[PDB]
Coordinates of all heavy atoms in Angstrom, one line a residue:
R1 N -2.2 -27.1 -8.3 CA -3.2 -26.1 -8.7 C -3.9 -25.4 -7.6 O -4.0 -24.2 -7.4 CB -4.1 -26.8 -9.6 CG -5.4 -25.9 -9.9 CD -6.3 -26.6 -11.0 NE -6.5 -28.0 -10.6 CZ -7.1 -28.8 -11.7 NH1 -7.4 -28.4 -12.8 NH2 -7.2 -30.1 -11.3
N2 N -4.4 -26.3 -6.6 CA -5.1 -25.8 -5.4 C -4.1 -24.8 -4.6 O -4.4 -23.7 -4.4 CB -5.6 -26.9 -4.6 CG -6.6 -27.8 -5.3 OD1 -7.5 -27.2 -5.9 ND2 -6.6 -29.1 -5.2
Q3 N -2.9 -25.3 -4.2 CA -2.0 -24.5 -3.4 C -1.8 -23.3 -4.3 O -1.9 -22.1 -3.7 CB -0.8 -25.3 -3.1 CG -1.0 -26.2 -1.9 CD -1.8 -27.4 -2.2 OE1 -2.9 -27.7 -1.7 NE2 -1.2 -28.3 -3.0
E4 N -1.3 -23.4 -5.4 CA -0.9 -22.3 -6.3 C -2.1 -21.2 -6.3 O -1.8 -20.1 -6.4 CB -0.5 -22.7 -7.7 CG -0.2 -21.4 -8.5 CD 0.3 -21.8 -10.0 OE1 0.7 -22.9 -10.1 OE2 0.2 -21.0 -10.9
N5 N -3.3 -21.7 -6.4 CA -4.4 -20.6 -6.4 C -4.4 -19.9 -5.2 O -4.6 -18.7 -5.0 CB -5.8 -21.3 -6.8 CG -6.7 -20.4 -7.4 OD1 -6.2 -19.4 -8.1 ND2 -7.9 -20.7 -7.3
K6 N -4.2 -20.7 -4.0 CA -4.1 -20.0 -2.7 C -3.0 -18.9 -2.6 O -3.3 -17.8 -2.3 CB -3.8 -21.1 -1.6 CG -4.7 -22.4 -1.8 CD -4.0 -23.5 -1.0 CE -4.7 -24.9 -1.4 NZ -4.0 -25.9 -0.7
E7 N -1.8 -19.2 -3.2 CA -0.8 -18.3 -3.2 C -1.1 -17.1 -4.1 O -0.6 -16.0 -3.9 CB 0.6 -18.8 -3.4 CG 1.2 -19.6 -2.4 CD 0.9 -21.1 -2.5 OE1 0.2 -21.5 -3.5 OE2 1.2 -22.0 -1.6
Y8 N -1.7 -17.4 -5.2 CA -2.1 -16.3 -6.2 C -2.9 -15.3 -5.5 O -2.8 -14.1 -5.5 CB -2.8 -16.9 -7.3 CG -3.4 -15.9 -8.3 CD1 -2.7 -14.7 -8.6 CD2 -4.6 -15.8 -8.7 CE1 -3.2 -13.7 -9.3 CE2 -5.2 -14.8 -9.4 CZ -4.5 -13.8 -9.8 OH -5.0 -12.7 -10.5
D9 N -4.0 -15.9 -4.9 CA -4.9 -14.9 -4.1 C -4.1 -14.2 -3.0 O -4.4 -13.0 -2.8 CB -6.1 -15.7 -3.5 CG -6.7 -16.5 -4.6 OD1 -6.6 -16.2 -5.7 OD2 -7.6 -17.4 -4.2
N10 N -3.4 -15.0 -2.2 CA -2.6 -14.3 -1.1 C -1.7 -13.1 -1.6 O -1.8 -12.0 -1.2 CB -1.8 -15.2 -0.4 CG -2.6 -16.5 0.0 OD1 -3.9 -16.4 0.2 ND2 -1.9 -17.6 0.3
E11 N -0.8 -13.4 -2.6 CA 0.0 -12.4 -3.3 C -0.7 -11.3 -3.8 O -0.4 -10.1 -3.6 CB 0.9 -13.0 -4.3 CG 0.2 -13.5 -5.5 CD 0.1 -12.5 -6.5 OE1 0.9 -11.6 -6.6 OE2 -0.8 -12.6 -7.5
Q12 N -1.9 -11.6 -4.5 CA -2.7 -10.4 -5.1 C -3.1 -9.5 -4.0 O -3.0 -8.3 -4.0 CB -3.8 -11.1 -5.9 CG -4.6 -10.1 -6.6 CD -5.7 -10.8 -7.5 OE1 -5.8 -11.9 -7.6 NE2 -6.5 -9.9 -8.3
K13 N -3.7 -10.1 -3.1 CA -4.4 -9.2 -1.9 C -3.2 -8.5 -1.2 O -3.4 -7.3 -0.9 CB -5.1 -10.2 -0.9 CG -6.0 -11.0 -1.4 CD -6.1 -12.2 -0.6 CE -6.9 -13.5 -1.4 NZ -6.6 -14.8 -0.7
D14 N -2.1 -9.2 -0.9 CA -1.0 -8.6 -0.1 C -0.4 -7.4 -0.8 O -0.2 -6.3 -0.3 CB 0.0 -9.6 0.2 CG -0.6 -10.7 1.0 OD1 -1.7 -10.7 1.4 OD2 0.2 -11.7 1.2
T15 N -0.2 -7.6 -2.2 CA 0.5 -6.6 -2.9 C -0.4 -5.4 -3.3 O 0.1 -4.3 -3.3 CB 1.0 -7.2 -4.2 OG1 1.9 -6.3 -4.8 CG2 -0.1 -7.4 -5.3
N16 N -1.7 -5.6 -3.4 CA -2.7 -4.5 -3.4 C -2.7 -3.8 -2.2 O -2.7 -2.5 -2.2 CB -4.1 -5.0 -3.8 CG -4.2 -5.6 -5.1 OD1 -3.5 -5.1 -6.0 ND2 -5.2 -6.4 -5.4
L17 N -2.7 -4.5 -1.0 CA -2.5 -3.8 0.3 C -1.3 -3.0 0.4 O -1.3 -1.9 0.9 CB -2.6 -4.8 1.4 CG -2.7 -4.2 2.8 CD1 -3.9 -3.4 3.0 CD2 -2.5 -5.3 3.9
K18 N -0.1 -3.5 -0.1 CA 1.1 -2.7 -0.1 C 0.9 -1.5 -1.0 O 1.6 -0.5 -0.6 CB 2.2 -3.6 -0.5 CG 2.8 -4.5 0.7 CD 2.0 -5.6 1.0 CE 2.6 -6.5 2.1 NZ 1.7 -7.6 2.5
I19 N 0.4 -1.6 -2.1 CA 0.2 -0.4 -3.0 C -0.7 0.6 -2.2 O -0.3 1.9 -2.2 CB -0.4 -0.8 -4.3 CG1 0.6 -1.4 -5.2 CG2 -1.0 0.4 -5.1 CD1 0.1 -2.0 -6.6
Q20 N -1.7 0.2 -1.6 CA -2.5 1.1 -0.9 C -1.6 1.9 0.2 O -1.9 2.9 0.4 CB -3.7 0.4 -0.3 CG -4.4 1.3 0.7 CD -5.3 0.4 1.7 OE1 -5.4 -0.8 1.6 NE2 -5.9 1.0 2.6
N21 N -0.8 1.0 1.0 CA -0.1 1.5 2.1 C 0.9 2.5 1.6 O 1.3 3.6 2.2 CB 0.5 0.4 2.8 CG -0.6 -0.5 3.4 OD1 -1.7 -0.1 3.6 ND2 -0.2 -1.8 3.7
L22 N 1.7 2.1 0.4 CA 2.5 3.0 -0.1 C 1.9 4.4 -0.5 O 2.4 5.5 -0.4 CB 3.3 2.4 -1.3 CG 4.7 1.8 -1.0 CD1 5.2 1.3 -2.3 CD2 5.5 2.8 -0.4
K23 N 0.7 4.3 -1.1 CA -0.1 5.5 -1.4 C -0.4 6.3 -0.3 O -0.3 7.6 -0.2 CB -1.3 5.2 -2.2 CG -1.0 4.6 -3.6 CD -2.3 4.0 -4.3 CE -2.0 3.4 -5.7 NZ -3.1 2.6 -6.3
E24 N -0.7 5.8 0.9 CA -1.2 6.4 2.2 C 0.1 7.0 2.7 O 0.0 8.1 3.3 CB -1.9 5.5 3.0 CG -3.3 5.1 2.7 CD -3.9 4.0 3.7 OE1 -3.2 3.7 4.4 OE2 -5.1 3.7 3.4
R25 N 1.3 6.3 2.7 CA 2.5 6.9 3.1 C 2.9 8.1 2.3 O 3.3 9.2 2.8 CB 3.6 5.9 3.2 CG 4.9 6.3 3.9 CD 6.0 6.7 2.9 NE 7.2 7.0 3.4 CZ 7.5 8.2 4.0 NH1 6.7 9.3 4.1 NH2 8.7 8.3 4.6
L26 N 2.8 8.0 1.1 CA 3.0 9.1 0.2 C 2.1 10.3 0.6 O 2.4 11.6 0.7 CB 2.8 8.8 -1.2 CG 2.9 10.0 -2.2 CD1 4.2 10.6 -2.2 CD2 2.7 9.5 -3.6
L27 N 0.8 10.0 0.9 CA -0.2 11.1 1.4 C 0.3 11.7 2.6 O 0.2 13.0 2.7 CB -1.6 10.4 1.6 CG -2.6 11.2 2.3 CD1 -3.1 12.3 1.3 CD2 -3.7 10.2 2.8
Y28 N 0.7 10.9 3.7 CA 1.1 11.6 4.9 C 2.4 12.3 4.8 O 2.5 13.4 5.3 CB 1.3 10.4 6.0 CG 2.1 11.1 7.2 CD1 1.3 11.8 8.1 CD2 3.4 10.9 7.4 CE1 1.9 12.4 9.1 CE2 4.1 11.4 8.4 CZ 3.4 12.2 9.3 OH 4.0 12.7 10.5
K29 N 3.3 11.8 3.9 CA 4.5 12.6 3.7 C 4.3 14.0 3.0 O 4.9 15.0 3.3 CB 5.6 11.8 3.0 CG 6.9 12.5 2.9 CD 7.5 12.8 4.2 CE 8.7 13.5 4.1 NZ 9.3 13.9 5.5
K30 N 3.3 13.9 2.1 CA 3.0 15.1 1.4 C 2.3 16.0 2.4 O 2.5 17.2 2.4 CB 2.0 14.8 0.3 CG 2.6 14.2 -1.0 CD 1.6 13.7 -2.0 CE 2.3 13.1 -3.1 NZ 1.3 12.4 -4.0
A31 N 1.5 15.6 3.3 CA 0.8 16.3 4.3 C 1.8 16.9 5.3 O 1.8 18.3 5.4 CB -0.1 15.4 5.2
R32 N 2.8 16.2 5.7 CA 3.8 16.8 6.6 C 4.6 17.8 5.9 O 4.9 19.1 6.4 CB 4.6 15.8 7.3 CG 5.6 16.3 8.4 CD 6.3 15.3 9.3 NE 7.0 16.0 10.3 CZ 7.5 15.4 11.3 NH1 7.4 14.0 11.5 NH2 8.3 15.9 12.3
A33 N 5.0 17.4 4.7 CA 6.0 18.3 3.9 C 5.2 19.7 3.5 O 5.7 20.8 3.9 CB 6.2 17.7 2.5
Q34 N 3.9 19.7 3.1 CA 3.1 20.8 2.8 C 2.9 21.6 4.0 O 2.8 22.9 4.0 CB 1.8 20.4 2.0 CG 1.1 21.6 1.5 CD -0.2 21.2 0.9 OE1 -0.5 20.0 0.9 NE2 -1.2 22.2 0.6
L35 N 2.5 21.0 5.2 CA 2.1 21.8 6.4 C 3.3 22.5 6.9 O 3.3 23.7 7.3 CB 1.5 20.8 7.4 CG 0.9 21.6 8.6 CD1 -0.4 22.3 8.2 CD2 0.5 20.5 9.7
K36 N 4.5 21.8 6.9 CA 5.7 22.4 7.5 C 6.1 23.4 6.6 O 6.6 24.7 7.0 CB 6.8 21.3 7.6 CG 8.0 21.8 8.2 CD 9.1 20.7 8.3 CE 8.6 19.6 9.4 NZ 8.7 20.1 10.9
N37 N 5.9 23.3 5.3 CA 6.4 24.5 4.3 C 5.4 25.5 4.4 O 5.8 26.7 4.3 CB 6.3 23.9 3.0 CG 7.3 22.6 2.9 OD1 8.3 22.4 3.5 ND2 7.0 21.8 1.8
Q38 N 4.1 25.3 4.6 CA 3.1 26.3 4.8 C 3.5 27.1 6.1 O 3.4 28.5 6.0 CB 1.7 25.8 4.9 CG 1.1 25.1 3.7 CD 0.1 24.2 4.1 OE1 -0.2 23.9 5.2 NE2 -0.6 23.6 3.1
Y39 N 3.9 26.5 7.2 CA 4.3 27.2 8.3 C 5.6 28.0 8.1 O 5.9 29.0 8.7 CB 4.4 26.3 9.5 CG 3.0 26.0 10.1 CD1 2.2 24.9 9.8 CD2 2.4 27.0 10.9 CE1 1.0 24.7 10.2 CE2 1.1 26.8 11.5 CZ 0.5 25.6 11.1 OH -0.8 25.3 11.6

């Protein structure tokens, strides 16, 4: 139980961080796409 709670917290935090990072990567790709298309 103790270990599994450790991994639950770890996986939860890590996968939230990955979702945030994917959103930020989408943000930057949209930025480059839109700026290059604007030019």
Side-chain angles (χ1 to χ4, degrees):
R1 162 174 52 190
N2 295 318
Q3 282 73 244
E4 171 178 344
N5 209 23
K6 314 166 198 172
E7 291 88 5
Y8 170 47
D9 308 344
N10 308 340
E11 66 89 22
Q12 184 174 2
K13 313 152 198 164
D14 302 350
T15 197
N16 289 335
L17 184 64
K18 276 73 176 176
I19 283 174
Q20 170 204 355
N21 300 335
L22 265 181
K23 293 171 182 172
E24 286 175 1
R25 188 263 186 274
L26 176 62
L27 169 72
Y28 169 79
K29 184 61 180 175
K30 289 173 185 170
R32 191 166 182 172
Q34 184 186 356
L35 190 68
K36 186 180 289 293
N37 307 334
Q38 296 160 353
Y39 280 98

